[PDB]
Design a protein around this ligand. Structure first.
Ligand code: HEM
Ligand SMILES: Cc1cccc(C(=O)O)c1
Ligand SMILES: [Cl-]
Length: 393
């Protein structure tokens, strides 16, 4: 009834060019079985969206990586939000929502925008830069650790820790096992910065700890909620902004449209998140036997959702393989969908918007002028190196 495929969606060959294999996964059927890892897969928009929006049947508390927490110990204490189901999910989610709220965005927008403008000005003085290290990494590193309230010392641990976290959702391949081997100093740093005295007043971390007296969370929950922001809040935006610059570099017609109307910046970033899908995949675990797309899945089965594939499914999107900054992007699943839909999406969009605004106002051309190198991670899609020449407007 269900087609069986040998495609390994966590192989370097797949990461290097996932699009043919994603079409093979979509076209094989609404539900596939991946013999390499003994999991079900859904790669079409309809089934990915259905799975995301039924958290009772497709739960997160048995892990959103390949490992089933009912069968194996999690490599770190479970996240109180990502790896929780309702009702335990609900109040921690509400706290992070209020921490990363519209009012918070209003307090930080001017500073985030000034830092974006300053970075682009600095890069234009160099002309030839690496849009990963020098822009996609450098700009989030210049705003997000400060917005968290982190001290200066030890920030070099943040990107390695996040790469470890996203590799650890994967199967036990070499990427995952090497990440865990090297993890001890990054975990130690991160767990220490989650404690209330190490988070500067007014930042996101202090605000989480200040929410521990309302009856929503207790003091002993606040460090792991800070940990969620230090896990998910930096490396995602690095790959989101990197995706947007890579798109603008490959589609000069769209850079020209963005220059002519910088108010398209926010949608140009949203389209980059759909088009590249920095977070490629997440899993759920079935809590019962369930019929999905005419297939019957037993209880306690892992289901791999291909978010990037759903965002390119021609059953849902017209010309899905085109980067179009005026596309109606509403409904893409690059931030997820439903009760776990990215609680940091306003921070991500703020960063992406103000960076793309700075590019739109200051840069006339973005030309790849060196070898492009991909970065391999079991969950994140993005580049290691993106040499570009920036021509000033
Ligand atoms: C381009 C940037 C980003 C992308 C593509 C992205 C993607 C996602 C996705 C797909 C999910 C859903 C997970 C699931 O359904 O299991 C999610 C959830 C989440 N994200 Fe984001 N994210 C981004 C930025 C951020 C930022 C900046 C933060 C924090 C400041 C953050 C914190 C979180 C958290 C804490 C969750 C868990 C929410 C929940 O389980 O209720 N993310 N993200
Ligand atoms: C979306 C996401 C990614 C990585 C870690 C977390 C977390 O809650 O720790 C969330
Ligand atoms: Cl940790």
């Amino acid at each position: 009834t269900i087609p069986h495929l040998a495609i390994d969606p966590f192989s370097l060959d797949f990461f290097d060019d996932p699009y043919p294999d994603q079409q093979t996964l979509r076209d094989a059927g609404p539900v596939v079985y991946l013999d390499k890892w003994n999991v079900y897969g859904v790669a079409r928009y309809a089934e990915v969206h259905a799975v995301l929006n039924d958290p009772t049947t497709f739960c997160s508390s048995r892990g959103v990586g390949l490992s089933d927490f009912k069968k194996e110990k999690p490599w770190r204490p479970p996240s109180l939000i990502l790896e929780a189901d309702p009702p335990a999910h609900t109040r921690p989610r509400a706290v992070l929502s209020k921490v990363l709220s519209p009012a918070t965005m209003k307090t930080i927008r001017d500073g985030f925008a000034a830092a974006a403008d300053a970075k682009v000005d600095e890069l234009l003085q160099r002309g030839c830069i690496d849009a990963i290290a020098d822009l996609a990494e450098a700009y989030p590193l210049s705003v997000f650790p400060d917005a968290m309230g982190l001290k200066q010392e030890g920030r070099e641990h943040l990107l390695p820790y996040a790469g470890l976290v996203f590799n650890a959702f994967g199967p036990p391949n070499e990427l995952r096992q090497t990440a865990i081997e090297r993890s001890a100093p990054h975990q130690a740093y991160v767990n220490e910065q989650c404690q209330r005295p190490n988070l500067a007043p007014g930042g996101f971390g202090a605000c989480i700890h200040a929410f521990t007296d309302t009856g929503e969370i207790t003091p002993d929950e606040a460090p792991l909620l800070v940990r969620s922001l230090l896990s998910a809040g930096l490396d995602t935006t690095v790959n989101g902004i990197g995706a947007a610059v890579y798109c603008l570099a490959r589609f000069p017609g769209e850079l020209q449209r963005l220059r002519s109307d910088p108010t398209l910046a926010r949608n140009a970033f949203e389209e980059a998140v759909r088009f590249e899908s920095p977070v490629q995949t997440f899993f759920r675990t079935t809590t019962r036997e369930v019929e999905l797309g005419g297939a019957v899945i037993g209880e306690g089965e892992k289901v791999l959702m291909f978010l990037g594939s759903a965002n390119r499914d021609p059953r849902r999107w017209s010309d899905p393989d085109l980067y179009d900054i005026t596309r109606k992007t509403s409904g893409h699943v690059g931030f997820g969908s439903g009760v776990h839909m990215c609680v940091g999406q306003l921070v991500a969009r703020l960063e992406g918007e103000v960076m793309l605004s700075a590019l739109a106002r200051k840069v006339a051309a973005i030309d790849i002028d060196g070898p492009v190198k991909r970065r391999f991670n079991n969950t994140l899609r993005g580049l290691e190196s993106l040499p570009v020449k920036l021509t000033p407007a």
